[PDB]
Amino acid sequence: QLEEVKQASIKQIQDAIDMEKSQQALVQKRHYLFDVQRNNIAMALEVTYRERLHRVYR
């Protein structure tokens, strides 16, 4: 009797945890990923225009 009690107890909260951890992550981290890269992209170009205005004038 007591075995089955705990067996469903484990499996049930297990799927609660893992699915809810999957849910929360995906939004932020993917939101993450998009803005990070954009970041990277944009930065480069700032420099690249600029540097040059130096390089040239030099």
Binding site: A25, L33, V36, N39, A42, L45, R50
Partner: peptide, 18 residues
């Protein structure tokens, strides 16, 4: 130039279900 900005997020990296 001039370009704006997002911080590291390591959680993000792993997950890419594409």
């Amino acid at each position: 130039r001039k370009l704006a900005l997002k911080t590291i997020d390591w959680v993000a990296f792993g997950e890419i279900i594409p």
